[model samples]
Target chain A: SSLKLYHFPVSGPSRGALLAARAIGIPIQIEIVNLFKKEQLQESFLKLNPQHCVPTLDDNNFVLWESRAIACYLADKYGKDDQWYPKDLQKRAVVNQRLYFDSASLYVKIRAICFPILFLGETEIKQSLKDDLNSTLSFLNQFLEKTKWVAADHPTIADTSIYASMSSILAVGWDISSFPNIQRWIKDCLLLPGAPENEDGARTFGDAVKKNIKQ
Target chain B: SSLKLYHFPVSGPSRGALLAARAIGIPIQIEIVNLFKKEQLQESFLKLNPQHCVPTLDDNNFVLWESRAIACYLADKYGKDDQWYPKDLQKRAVVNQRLYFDSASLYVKIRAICFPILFLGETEIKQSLKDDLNSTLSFLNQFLEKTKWVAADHPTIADTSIYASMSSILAVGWDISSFPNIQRWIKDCLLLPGAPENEDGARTFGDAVKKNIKQ
Candidate 1:
């Protein structure tokens, strides 16, 4: 009876997990952990996830963290159809690659730039880090040129994960105008099941970051 | 008949895929793309994988990259049994979490410290980065305290992937003397089918990186 997600929607990773749950149409109980208040560092949360990162899933005390893994598990465990995480090995392989890409490339760059601004009080992003993030975005643009959605013609948890982070990139006033394919695919992503909620959370995140940057 | 892997055993990620194939008892054709020579930037390799990273798989023309994904795909597609990637939802979720941890935290930290030394000609790793990497290692050490392998009693692809990268960290003179569990597990990982070959590759890689760093 216990399927709960510890979340803070204003963070991209947390939103990714919530988006996955919503996409699967599952009634996962949500527990908010306000990262702003350093809630994740508390003893109770640490016992649950020593990593203390949010979007930690507690499936009857089978606690797990790492946002992309949470999404994959939700799709694997609860999706009514295999559309969210296809049964075909090759198709699912693409989804897995994209998920790794999101974890290692897309979200890392965003966190690199934003975490400093939000927490470390750095008023501006380093030029090299910004350039690197743009390079990653350009690759995403190139990727969308071939597929209707990342990993396939259909929306998978890959879309949920990427969209949540990419939308936050937009919210922080990072310019994505040069990448047409990424722009088009993002609009397409908006039509996915939980896109609107993710966008709202990302917006809240982006605004928090936007306020911190030195004009 | 065509299950080919583009590899450079000197790279941790490339070794991960080869190790997975060996672990699974699958015969995968190997093609080396020397990153030191910038061969991955060639148009031929780019067509196969736009990101041009190593450990790319060409499974009868369905290409994929990202080392952990390649491990997962090989295990799912070729394994005689699901031991390398269990079918049980929660067990598999732990495996997935560790793989993401490898990609996002473990590999990224090592890359942060080594990439500049290897390619960018930077002489030293920043203190903040070293601290960050050690923090990741402590968490890994903690993780191994509970399991015989990374995810469960039996070794999974998560161990294959993490072992490849962790071995490299040791090769480059990074210390893990504080982590008894990790040291214990590394020896255990050597007992896995493909591990001897992976260690040989990681040793070669560590030697190259060690030569470049300023003493």
Candidate 2:
């Protein structure tokens, strides 16, 4: 059964799933969803994903969305090795915990940075946004400093899920170097074989950042 | 290796897991984490979950966060009936898709409305937030008009997870009655044995809704 991945490359969550699929050597045909043009809002696409969001995966006849959910499904159902998503109950729990943390906690601040830089433009950072981003980066820096990888001994699906934000956030003039570990980690991931070289492709994060800044 | 479910009664996500756990007859010890006091942010709590959010389940040594993940795991591991979470690939995919849609799309707008109401006191609703909420609720109402549940024939974990948001959103003055199917479905879920009731232990939807609206 062939795997079909529907996503926007500029989207952090989409990139997370893409990296996971690539790492596990799961052959996936990418279906780029143009989110900016409101293509996701169309009736046809809505049928495919009621959420009208990207990072949807069609695994043969089985359709899955939610980047973390899709990554876990792929790792559990198709992974060749334990590194991508560990089989040990405790280890996988750690991964699950991290993934959920991203959704519930980290995302608000990430969005705070990405949205303004991508939506409101960078005239002067809102005090609320700056405060939120600073606190978030500090918290993440503390976490990264204590751990070798984001969620495991080696890179797990959690790392891919979390790190997928770097290119997008960075493109928005985030100055991620303040979070040294994150910066170093992003460099390591970009050095990966399948990783895109310059964040240059169809509807790249750089483009989104550029658009937001102009607004 | 006993299953430990961490939850609070008013939390919709926690309640979703509780419903699923109870439905499957999984022997789960429920622990109440008082989120109102920011108890989830305690250092001890952070050690267990960096997410600092509720509806965390400790399956033996495996600590799982995310209500959907916990429900899916429980159904896969313990559910005796396929009705709860279908085994058929396509049926399960449909359920998963809705779960993604709710988590990614609808959850955002619901949060936008409820965040201020739940987290902040009755303050002026920011124009941006109000606009986002209005659009989101309209879409939700439209979707609910088509199905008894978010996805599939029976009320799977997806329905439970999405339905969990009722109290909070409705409490914020969002009119949920506009969606008749959703109203009916909420009533149907409440009729199920072992479903989480209101603080006063109201078992019926009508009673619970009345109680929650006053909050």
Candidate 3:
């Protein structure tokens, strides 16, 4: 493995990067940093990434984090073709749009619910936050109405990155049955290289949320 | 001004897109959507963007949103050269990384403070959220210690994008004097074609936040 990815499977973003590497069929060394055990707090890892976050990539020595960025870098440097990250500017722009949407809107809402419950002892998910997440999902449902894939007619890193969040969203019992397009898209998304393969980690994260939900 | 940017100056991300267009020196038509007036909910705008975010770019009929993505699109399509968004893989990766950092970390923190105050009637700032934002700022300071500009030796859209939030952060009277590098960087960032010019909008947002605080 020429690339070293510091990863924690329980993390959706980490899985996003991992799924991208798998989809691109790039060889990568996965180094687990057990976030639950505070392994990310170690001095060496902190030296590698001051942000001390998972799915940090050291391509030889060029260090990178922010999981979606890692996916873009991998697709750029290692993808078999530009299909995973097109060179056509308009196509590329849509991918960038979806990536930011996930980073800023989708993942933020997910963390808003999950972070408070997991770390801050929030016993119940706020109705407003749930409604907000559902609103973003409805927008996503609309996106799927036309495109066969998230950013194009074929799968790209955008799908890979978003699926990481989507998988965890499902595991946590946020129903998508009402978003018929999303449910259909999920079926296609699961067939990608990383899908069910990333299942265990998503379950691990969901179980933690379930346990801490004041049940 | 073939490109139309639906803009609200008070919104930092919207300002980010506008800043990039100016820095890129691209001619663009500015369409005002008063977020404060809830004009983003207007049916016409919602048709343009179901998510109804400002800084949406309509290049003729090609619709786009997510401010940083708009910056990336404009830079790739119209940059005099690739300096603002380098074509070099390593260089571009840093730019992309910083863009995501701004979107997911920096801007998220800024909004977490500002959004509730503006919309949800949050009066007192959460101490932990404030502390978390300061921690992110320290990392930006560390980044500045190495490069003259964020993500590169020279200005990139990354710097432009982050400056949009930095300006608002200062306007809200969150001191950056202690982070000497940030102070120095802010001085340089203001000289960009978009800065100081954006000051009024930042102040408008800050004033709203200030008036609402339980002072």
Worst-scoring 10-residue span by lDDT in model 1 chain B: B39-48
Which residue pairs come into collision in candidate 1? none
lDDT of 2 by residue, B109-194 (tens): 56654555444463445667766665655665655667766675567877776666554455445555556666677677665546
lDDT of every predicted structure (CA atoms): 0.87, 0.66, 0.88
Mind giving the per-residue lDDT tens digits that candidate 3 earns over B33-77? Answer: 887777445665768776667889999889998899999999999
Model 2 residue pairs with clashes: none
Structural similarity of chain A in candidate 2, as TM-score: 0.84
Q: Per-residue error at A183 for model 1, in Å? A: 0.5
Candidate 1 — what's its lDDT?
0.87
Candidate 3 CAPRI category: high
lDDT string for model 1 (B97-157, tens) is 9999999899988988888788778887679889999999999999899988999988998
Q: Which stretches of candidate 1 lie over 4 Å from their true place?
A: A39-47, B39-47
Please give the RMSD to the true structure for each candidate, in Å. 1.9, 4.8, 1.9
- Alpha-carbon shift of residue B82 in model 2 (angstroms): 4.3
Cα deviation in Å at residue A155, candidate 2? 2.2
Report the C-alpha lDDT of model 3 over A1-215, residue by residue, as the tens digit: 37899889999999999999999999888888888987445665778776667889999899988899999999989988998989888899999999998999899899989998999979888999999999999988888987988888799999998899988878888988879988988889879996876888899999999989875
